[PDB]
Design an enzyme around this catalytic site. Structure first.
Site, PDB file in Angstrom:
ATOM      1  N   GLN A 286       0.399  -1.117  -0.044  1.00 46.83           N
ATOM      2  CA  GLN A 286       0.338  -0.245   0.156  1.00 46.83           C
ATOM      3  C   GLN A 286       0.276   1.352   0.567  1.00 46.83           C
ATOM      4  O   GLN A 286       0.492   2.040   0.081  1.00 46.83           O
ATOM      5  CB  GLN A 286      -1.530  -0.325   0.869  1.00 46.83           C
ATOM      6  CG  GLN A 286      -0.120   0.129   2.638  1.00 46.83           C
ATOM      7  CD  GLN A 286      -0.582   2.094   2.781  1.00 46.83           C
ATOM      8  OE1 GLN A 286      -1.711   1.583   2.058  1.00 46.83           O
ATOM      9  NE2 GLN A 286       0.489   2.069   3.549  1.00 46.83           N
TER      10      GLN A 286
ATOM     11  N   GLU B 216      22.958  -1.344 -19.720  1.00 43.52           N
ATOM     12  CA  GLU B 216      24.415  -0.989 -20.154  1.00 43.52           C
ATOM     13  C   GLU B 216      24.640  -0.604 -17.826  1.00 43.52           C
ATOM     14  O   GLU B 216      25.869  -1.037 -17.761  1.00 43.52           O
ATOM     15  CB  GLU B 216      24.343  -0.219 -20.659  1.00 43.52           C
ATOM     16  CG  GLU B 216      24.774   0.279 -22.640  1.00 43.52           C
ATOM     17  CD  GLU B 216      23.344  -0.094 -22.682  1.00 43.52           C
ATOM     18  OE1 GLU B 216      22.621  -0.473 -22.036  1.00 43.52           O
ATOM     19  OE2 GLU B 216      23.381  -0.808 -24.136  1.00 43.52           O
TER      20      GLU B 216
HETATM   21  N1  LIG Z   1       6.209   4.757  -0.661  1.00 46.18           N
HETATM   22  C1  LIG Z   1       5.657   5.108   0.796  1.00 46.18           C
HETATM   23  N2  LIG Z   1       5.264   4.486   2.309  1.00 46.18           N
HETATM   24  C2  LIG Z   1       4.219   5.106   2.381  1.00 46.18           C
HETATM   25  C3  LIG Z   1       3.335   5.854   2.577  1.00 46.18           C
HETATM   26  N3  LIG Z   1       2.401   6.387   3.328  1.00 46.18           N
HETATM   27  C4  LIG Z   1       3.680   5.143   4.607  1.00 46.18           C
HETATM   28  N4  LIG Z   1       3.905   4.441   4.403  1.00 46.18           N
HETATM   29  C5  LIG Z   1       5.128   3.716   5.223  1.00 46.18           C
HETATM   30  O1  LIG Z   1       5.166   2.765   3.428  1.00 46.18           O
HETATM   31  C6  LIG Z   1       5.016   1.472   4.345  1.00 46.18           C
HETATM   32  C7  LIG Z   1       4.410   0.620   3.943  1.00 46.18           C
HETATM   33  O2  LIG Z   1       4.967  -0.808   4.035  1.00 46.18           O
HETATM   34  P1  LIG Z   1       3.068  -1.858   4.577  1.00 46.18           P
HETATM   35  O3  LIG Z   1       2.421  -1.244   5.683  1.00 46.18           O
HETATM   36  O4  LIG Z   1       2.415  -3.003   4.349  1.00 46.18           O
HETATM   37  O5  LIG Z   1       1.583  -1.659   3.312  1.00 46.18           O
HETATM   38  P2  LIG Z   1       1.380  -2.778   2.335  1.00 46.18           P
HETATM   39  O6  LIG Z   1       2.110  -3.808   2.515  1.00 46.18           O
HETATM   40  O7  LIG Z   1       1.243  -2.085   1.113  1.00 46.18           O
HETATM   41  O8  LIG Z   1      -0.609  -3.080   3.189  1.00 46.18           O
HETATM   42  P3  LIG Z   1      -0.695  -2.660   4.934  1.00 46.18           P
HETATM   43  O9  LIG Z   1      -0.768  -3.706   5.919  1.00 46.18           O
HETATM   44  O10 LIG Z   1      -2.082  -3.258   4.679  1.00 46.18           O
HETATM   45  O11 LIG Z   1      -0.322  -1.705   5.387  1.00 46.18           O
HETATM   46  C8  LIG Z   1       4.030   2.072   5.962  1.00 46.18           C
HETATM   47  O12 LIG Z   1       4.946   0.975   6.659  1.00 46.18           O
HETATM   48  C9  LIG Z   1       4.332   3.244   6.171  1.00 46.18           C
HETATM   49  O13 LIG Z   1       5.665   3.636   7.150  1.00 46.18           O
HETATM   50  C10 LIG Z   1       3.636   6.374   1.542  1.00 46.18           C
HETATM   51  O14 LIG Z   1       2.127   6.692   1.192  1.00 46.18           O
HETATM   52  N5  LIG Z   1       4.520   5.790   0.519  1.00 46.18           N
END
Ligand SMILES: Nc1nc2c(ncn2[C@@H]2O[C@H](COP(=O)(O)OP(=O)(O)OP(=O)(O)O)[C@@H](O)[C@H]2O)c(=O)[nH]1
Ligand SMILES: Nc1nc2c(ncn2[C@@H]2O[C@H](COP(=O)(O)OP(=O)(O)OP(=O)(O)O)[C@@H](O)[C@H]2O)c(=O)[nH]1
Ligand SMILES: Nc1nc2c(ncn2[C@@H]2O[C@H](COP(=O)(O)OP(=O)(O)OP(=O)(O)O)[C@@H](O)[C@H]2O)c(=O)[nH]1
Lengths: 54, 51, 34, 438, 99, 105, 49, 427, 438
Positions: free
Chosen positions: I11, I254
């Site tokens: 996410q 490359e």
């Molecule tokens: N790149 C990015 N990272 C984020 C954003 N918002 C939060 N994060 C961080 O990125 C991490 C996302 O990993 P997960 O929490 O496992 O997200 P997921 O695997 O898509 O699914 P969930 O378990 O539901 O959250 C979170 O722990 C946040 O700390 C964002 O908008 N963009």
């Protein structure tokens, strides 16, 4: 040089006039100084007129 | 008491103490911890890595 | 500064005899004056 | 090419550098905004400012100086002043905690964490510069933040960069005036630490700066602006060779090579002759002879040293303005013939003449006179040891009853370091008469 | 007082404008050199020599206008202080009466 | 990491503004023979037989001065007061200053 | 040379009259604020009557 | 940036800070309500050394008020500036002290020290990096001495790296009203000298004479006396908040003051004191200021150091002055009384000049003194203690509380050791 | 021809890919509706979009990326955004059940029934593509749904397609910030699965992303919009060589050939030099010399590593904008002479230069600067092992007391997979040291 000296003297006169008016304004504040004037009016910082500030 | 002479002895054996390695960043940047900053520390110094 | 220790000992005695007359705290400055 | 960098350490070193840069923008006609008029002088940063400012394609003259400070107080209003737009924001090194007049506090407690940052400023200034002959260090021996912080930086810039010159400028402690009694503590600490590293240390004293002005400038009520005006003129005069040419041009490299006789002692004394009020300049005449008499008149020096109580080794004169070789060579020849003037018999010649066509300018809203022929007198004599002789009896009593050490030992030193400086001094004083002995 | 101040503003502004354009044209013209372009033959004339003003008188105009603005600003500051003091006294008197 | 040929004026601290010499260089190589065997597997892993730089690098009082004419005893310490600090004599931009002077009599 | 002299002479007056108009505008804003303050006081006056 | 959190102690202190804080608000131009009226740019930015920001441009005081009796707190709350003080900062107890030092030091303190430490650390975390702390209290004050000695001890180990400024008033030597006051004072000073770094000495009798000397107004209010000391403590703090070629840190000042660690007691000095005709009969000049600055009558702290000698002296000058006059005035006084200083230290003068005049006068100054005149103070209380301890008057109360005579033994001994400290240095 | 496909998993990966696509339409001027103005660029899908968007005869630019997610929240809200009409509905692969931060829950429980559907997306995209050089995998090591789901898809795309590149991009775990304590667990799980299959993995860390944001961008209060703008710029810069030309054009092959020294380790570091606020860019100037130092300045790297603690192997600079060969070839020659820069002697040459004429553009309502000379610095050094070394002394503690395992073994695992991953890391560290030993 003379013109610079002449205007240098004028700055002296003006700052004399400037420092003078500072004194009279300073004198005026001391005249109206509440600590100096000790008005018995500002002693009533209480809300009720029957009660005073001790 | 020759507390005058004591003050000599007080500072003669006063040894010294130590500062703490901390850093700064900016214009008004604050006192950002250098010590174990996680940025430029001596992290790989333990008998557990690799082996 | 001196090249030879003999000049070193020659110099120091020359200023030692001229110590009190010379001005300056270390008595090397010049008495001068008329 | 021909450029240098200025550094301003100690909360005292910042207001003086401000005036110096305020002075420097006048002769170039710099507007407070940072740009010239529609006239064409901008480019990659190459014109009269190239030695001093950095006016790139952005068109903004960026001064090549870093102002370092440990208290936000005095460094902020200048960042809200009139030329703050000119100054590079992160070139104006500020702090949040003071050294409390303590060398070691600035030298140990806070010095480590800030020097790396200013070292970054140094290198990113170093890369952009091209020839960068040396540095312009503005400090003070009684540096409330100058003492400790200047020492550590000049250590770090010396060890990484040792192949160039380093030019030092500090207010000398007032012989009979002391606004601090821990001032001898750090002042001797600064001196003994700097003797083995500093290239050229130039001193000055405020009392005689005041003493001059109500003598001939006739102002019984000067101001720091007036004080900063005179010293800023001094550094302006010495940098006029960089700014302007003449019959011959001289450089700091010549200044180092020709002034210092021998190692350790590298402490000549500056002087500026045509110090006079505008009105006294108005109905009087200036020529080489009298200013040559005036420049060597004993009461015209800002340092409390009777030159007759000592003997001369070197004398540098820098004539800025409309002069000719004829009178000056004749005048200096008469100076050599004088008897009261006592150079060491060791040196036949000790004179380094500087010729510059440019008449020095007045400053608007200023106090100086209008000068056509100027001269700056950087010289070294043996009459200076009395000042350190004044310091030692001051210091030797104090350390025996070891006042204020409870603070210094309280934050992490011992007495061995204080011991070193005294025989360091005892070396300098004992050397002074040895070289003073012919 | 507002009206007077704005009028003086406008007058000094228009004179400033004029010196701006004249300065710009002078700088642009000054870049000329003998070999370059923008080099033309005309006949001479008398408006080449027409006489209308002199530098010292022009500087007199400028300084006089400066003085006008200076005095008007002084008067404005004085009036503002008077207004503040009047407000103070009014509030105090009302307070005492109601008490 | 070598010095080039002939046109040895276009690459100098003259433009680098370098105040600590970059790297000693040279133009000479002994005529190398050797099928240049490979002595690792896939990872920079030296075969135990062949040697390496055996964990040699893994990862102030020093100043320029000439002894000139300053009292021998003071000068003698200065030499020691220069050296005995490998934390400033070995690596990491070089850390190593120079020295000169002449003895006394 | 003469042209250059005249040009710098003009530039001076340009600068000071710039700055002068600036402080005039600032002071006008200040009296705006104080006039509005008096208006608010007059607004508040009514109720006790 | 560096800042200060203030502590309000003692029932006298309850008045002290009240006058002290309103002076600051009036000095900086904030209304009693709290909505600052933008008038001076310089006071706008350097207000965060003492005040934090609240909504609607309100400058919340970062000070803590502590007491035991609600009525005084009700009064200071009902003052012209009680609104600017926070109900959060109003910590207190529900008991009467008997103004007993031990009760405020052992019994009533125990259940309040927890709460008060939370408030200060809440305020401490509200700010980033402090110089230190200052305390308004009394050494002769029953409840203030009990609370402060506890608080100063606790904050020492809490932050042993800051400035423990202390402001205490010395009771009247001729009469103490409180008869157990010397017991209260001698106990407090024992820990105080152990814990403090800076201390101001203040006496009402000198203030009473000053009313007879320059105020000339016969009958003042105690607040008028507070107005004077608030002006003094404001003047020393003006150096921090205001610009000008003068260095501000109290440590920067402190490293210029204390020859040896046991020197914590310092005396004030203030700027033109003027009477009815003399306001229009004074030519305000740095000489006549400097003359008045070192006047035997201008002092207000303890007594005349004409009896003793002058260890370290520091005068800070607030107004449009310059280095030259303060230099020559310093030379003039140095030549005026060269022998009256100590040969142990020459050039014992420390000078700073503030370029920002106060609101009410242009050229002003403040003096802080360290001389050999405090000996008279504690030699008086020395016999006071011995005479009362000769026959242990009013002692069953403290034994009932749990106090024993042995505590007094080192307290006076530590006091006596400090007395020998002052002379054998100076004599 | 020259095209690729992007994947956005976890996410966290869903907003970042959106902003990149949001960025991508700007430089092509794509309207949110899906069509260009009356100007002619549409066709069979062949123009600057032909590599990025699929603007067929229907006239609608269809981005060549798939957004995969396991929770409907963020995927549905973007389906009601501004560009949702552009996006393909079931390319926005949604899910109804979460991985619960659990790698294997994402890897086993639900991934089985979804990958086949995703595989249909892959092949239906694969068949229409022509050049299909590789893939742009946007994920996160602490992938709440990224960790497990990215691993399984990477396996299946690796086994069916092993002839093309796979480009991986994950937020590296914050060294001192852990928003989850299972975040290490799955992170090491991700690392060990990907070491033997992944082609090129590039990481970045948020903490340092903020660090610049207030250092030189001067924003104490930025948001992910700024953060996604930064990373969206980064991927835009690397794709500019694809989007446009320059003095020379370089392809992902490359880099892959020139970045990875030896198998397994394929983890270089990204950095972009001209990062500055607009007003600071306003009165200053940019050229190759200074931006060269800044990108190699140790504090400008988004990874918590000291280059002096390590040694360089690979470094890639890609210059987007107006540059000339003369200064850049000289400027890099300065860096080779630099002493702090400690490359391994194995590589006399360790640089890959990419020149692109196009000046990087600003985004409306953005916070970036006005860049004419830009360079993104991709490099690999030995100073990276501390991060994994940070994880293991973290991981070894919890595993020794086997916390949270009751969940993992509870829903279907054992300690063997955990057992395997650790000596693989132990292999990596000694490998990192053996390469570090010369
Ligand atoms: N790149 C990015 N990272 C984020 C954003 N918002 C939060 N994060 C961080 O990125 C991490 C996302 O990993 P997960 O929490 O496992 O997200 P997921 O695997 O898509 O699914 P969930 O378990 O539901 O959250 C979170 O722990 C946040 O700390 C964002 O908008 N963009
Ligand atoms: N050159 C110069 N010296 C000054 C000036 N004003 C005061 N001084 C003297 O120079 C010394 C400066 O040292 P410090 O007082 O430690 O100043 P600092 O180290 O920058 O910081 P502070 O401790 O906060 O004052 C002072 O002791 C003064 O005696 C000035 O304007 N210019
Ligand atoms: N508020 C106030 N206190 C005064 C005044 N004059 C002298 N003081 C003294 O200042 C001292 C300090 O106040 P506190 O420490 O709060 O007093 P306390 O602990 O309750 O004990 P007491 O001394 O009995 O009042 C008191 O002891 C008084 O003796 C005055 O006019 N007003």
């Amino acid at each position: 040089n003379k013109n610079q000296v002449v205007e240098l003297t004028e700055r002296k006169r003006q700052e004399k006039q400037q420092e003078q008016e500072d004194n009279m304004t300073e004198i005026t504040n001391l005249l109206h100084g509440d600590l100096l004037s000790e008005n018995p009016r500002p002693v009533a910082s209480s809300f009720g007129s029957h009660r005073v500030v001790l | 008491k020759n507390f005058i002479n004591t003050n000599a002895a007080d500072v003669i054996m006063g040894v010294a103490k130590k500062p703490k390695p901390i850093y700064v960043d900016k214009r008004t940047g604050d006192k950002h911890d250098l010590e174990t900053s996680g940025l430029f520390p001596k992290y790989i110094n333990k008998k557990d890595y690799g082996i | 500064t001196f090249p030879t220790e003999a000049d070193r000992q020659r110099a120091l005695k020359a200023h030692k005899e001229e110590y009190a007359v010379r001005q300056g705290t270390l008595r090397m400055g010049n008495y001068t004056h008329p | 090419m021909r450029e240098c960098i200025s550094i301003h350490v100690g909360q005292a070193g910042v207001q003086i550098g401000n005036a110096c840069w305020e002075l420097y923008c006048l002769e170039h006609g710099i507007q407070p905004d940072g740009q010239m008029p529609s006239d064409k002088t901008i480019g990659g940063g190459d014109d009269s400012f190239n030695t001093f400012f950095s006016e790139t394609g952005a068109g903004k003259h960026v001064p090549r100086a870093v102002f370092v400070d440990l208290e936000p107080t005095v460094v902020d209003e200048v960042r809200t002043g009139t030329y703050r737009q000119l100054f590079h924001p992160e070139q104006l090194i500020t702090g949040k905690e003071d050294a409390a007049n303590n060398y070691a506090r600035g030298h140990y407690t806070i010095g480590k964490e800030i020097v790396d940052l200013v070292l970054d400023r140094i290198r990113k200034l170093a890369d952009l510069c091209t020839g960068l002959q040396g540095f312009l260090i503005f400090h003070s021996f009684g540096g409330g933040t100058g003492s400790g912080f200047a020492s550590l930086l000049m250590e770090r810039l010396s060890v990484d960069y040792g192949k160039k010159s380093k030019l030092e400028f500090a207010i000398y402690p007032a012989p009979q005036v002391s606004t601090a009694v821990v001032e001898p503590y750090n002042s001797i600490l600064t001196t003994h630490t700097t003797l083995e590293h500093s290239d050229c240390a130039f001193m000055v004293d405020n009392e005689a700066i005041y003493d001059i002005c109500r003598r001939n400038l006739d102002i019984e009520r000067p101001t720091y602006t007036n004080l900063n005006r005179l010293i800023g003129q001094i550094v302006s005069s010495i940098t006029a060779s960089l700014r302007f040419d003449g019959a011959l041009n001289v450089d700091l490299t010549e200044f180092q090579t020709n002034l210092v006789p021998y190692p350790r002692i590298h402490f000549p004394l500056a002087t500026y002759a045509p110090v006079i009020s505008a009105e006294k300049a108005y109905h009087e005449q200036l020529s080489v002879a009298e200013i040559t008499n005036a420049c060597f008149e004993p009461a015209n020096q800002m340092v409390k040293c009777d030159p007759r109580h000592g003997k001369y080794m070197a004398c540098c004169m820098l004539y800025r303005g409309d002069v000719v070789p004829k009178d000056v060579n004749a005048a200096i020849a008469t100076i050599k013939t004088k008897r009261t003037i006592q150079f060491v018999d060791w040196c036949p010649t000790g004179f380094k003449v500087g010729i510059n066509y440019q008449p020095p300018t007045v400053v608007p809203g200023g106090d100086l006179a209008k000068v056509q022929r100027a001269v700056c007198m950087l010289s070294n004599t043996t009459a200076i040891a009395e000042a350190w002789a004044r310091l030692d009896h001051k210091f030797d009593l104090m350390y025996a009853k070891r006042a204020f050490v409870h603070w210094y030992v309280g934050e992490g030193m011992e007495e061995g370091e204080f011991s070193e400086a005294r025989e360091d001094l005892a070396a300098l004083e004992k050397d002074y008469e040895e070289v003073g002995v012919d | 007082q507002i009206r007077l101040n704005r009028e003086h503003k406008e007058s000094c502004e228009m004179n400033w404008s004029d010196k701006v354009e004249v300065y710009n044209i002078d700088d642009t013209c000054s870049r000329y050199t003998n070999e370059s372009t923008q080099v033309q033959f005309y006949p001479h004339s008398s408006k080449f020599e027409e006489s209308a003003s002199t530098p010292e008188t022009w500087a007199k105009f400028n300084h006089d206008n400066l003085l006008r603005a200076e005095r008007e600003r002084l008067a404005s500051v004085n009036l503002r202080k008077l207004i503040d003091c009047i407000l103070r006294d009014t509030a105090e008197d009302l307070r005492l009466q109601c008490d | 990491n070598y010095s080039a040929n002939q046109y040895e004026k276009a690459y100098l601290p003259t433009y680098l503004q370098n105040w600590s010499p970059a790297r000693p260089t040279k133009e000479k190589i002994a005529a190398h023979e050797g099928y240049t065997q490979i002595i690792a597997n896939d990872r920079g892993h030296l075969l135990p037989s062949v040697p390496r730089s055996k964990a040699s690098p893994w990862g102030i009082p020093p100043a320029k001065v000439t002894l000139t004419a300053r009292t021998t005893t003071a000068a003698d310490n200065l030499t020691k007061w220069i050296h005995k600090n490998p934390d400033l004599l070995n690596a990491c931009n070089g850390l190593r200053p120079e020295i000169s002077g002449k003895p006394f009599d | 040379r003469k042209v250059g002299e005249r040009l710098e002479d003009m530039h001076c007056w340009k600068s000071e009259l710039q700055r002068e108009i600036d402080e005039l505008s600032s002071e006008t804003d200040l009296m705006m604020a104080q006039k509005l303050r008096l208006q608010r006081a007059l607004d508040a006056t009514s109720v006790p009557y | 940036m560096r800042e200060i959190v203030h502590l309000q102690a003692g029932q006298c202190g309850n008045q002290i800070g009240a006058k002290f804080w309103e002076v600051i608000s009036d000095e900086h131009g904030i209304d009693p309500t709290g909505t600052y009226h933008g008038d001076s740019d310089l006071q706008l930015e350097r207000i965060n050394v003492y005040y934090n920001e609240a909504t609607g441009g309100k400058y919340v005081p970062r000070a803590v008020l502590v007491d035991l009796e609600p009525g005084t707190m009700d009064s200071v709350r009902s003052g012209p500036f009680g609104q600017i003080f926070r109900p959060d900062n109003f910590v207190f107890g529900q008991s009467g002290a008997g103004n007993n030092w031990a009760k405020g030091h052992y019994t009533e303190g125990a259940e309040l020290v927890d709460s008060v430490l939370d408030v200060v650390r809440k305020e401490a975390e509200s700010c980033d990096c402090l110089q230190g702390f200052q305390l308004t209290h009394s050494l002769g004050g029953g409840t203030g001495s009990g609370m402060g000695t506890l608080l100063i001890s606790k904050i020492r180990e809490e932050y042993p790296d800051r400035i423990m400024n202390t402001f205490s008033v010395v009771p009247s030597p001729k009469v103490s009203d409180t008869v157990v006051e010397p017991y209260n004072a001698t106990l407090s000073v024992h820990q105080l000298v152990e814990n403090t770094d800076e201390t101001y000495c203040i006496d009402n009798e000198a203030l009473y004479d000053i009313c007879f000397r320059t105020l000339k107004l016969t009958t003042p209010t105690y607040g008028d006396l507070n107005h004077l000391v608030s002006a003094t403590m404001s003047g020393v703090t003006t150096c921090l908040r205001f610009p000008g070629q003068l260095n501000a840190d109290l440590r920067k000042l402190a490293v210029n003051m204390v020859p040896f660690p046991r020197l914590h007691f310092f005396m004030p000095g203030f700027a033109p004191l003027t009477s009815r005709g003399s306001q229009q009969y004074r030519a305000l000049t740095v000489p006549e200021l400097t003359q008045q600055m070192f006047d035997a009558k201008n002092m207000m702290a303890a007594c005349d150091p004409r009896h003793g000698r002058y260890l370290t002296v520091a005068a800070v000058f607030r107004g449009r002055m310059s280095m030259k006059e303060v230099d020559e005035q310093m030379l003039n006084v140095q030549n005026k009384n060269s022998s009256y200083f100590v040969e142990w230290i020459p050039n014992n003068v420390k000078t700073a000049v503030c370029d920002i005049p106060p609101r009410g006068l242009k050229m002003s100054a403040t003096f802080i003194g360290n001389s050999t005149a405090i000996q008279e103070l504690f030699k008086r209380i020395s016999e006071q203690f011995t005479a009362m301890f000769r026959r242990k008057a009013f002692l069953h109360w403290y034994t009932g509380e749990g106090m024993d005579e042995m505590e007094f033994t080192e307290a006076e001994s530590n006091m006596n050791d400090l007395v020998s400290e002052y002379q054998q240095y100076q004599d």
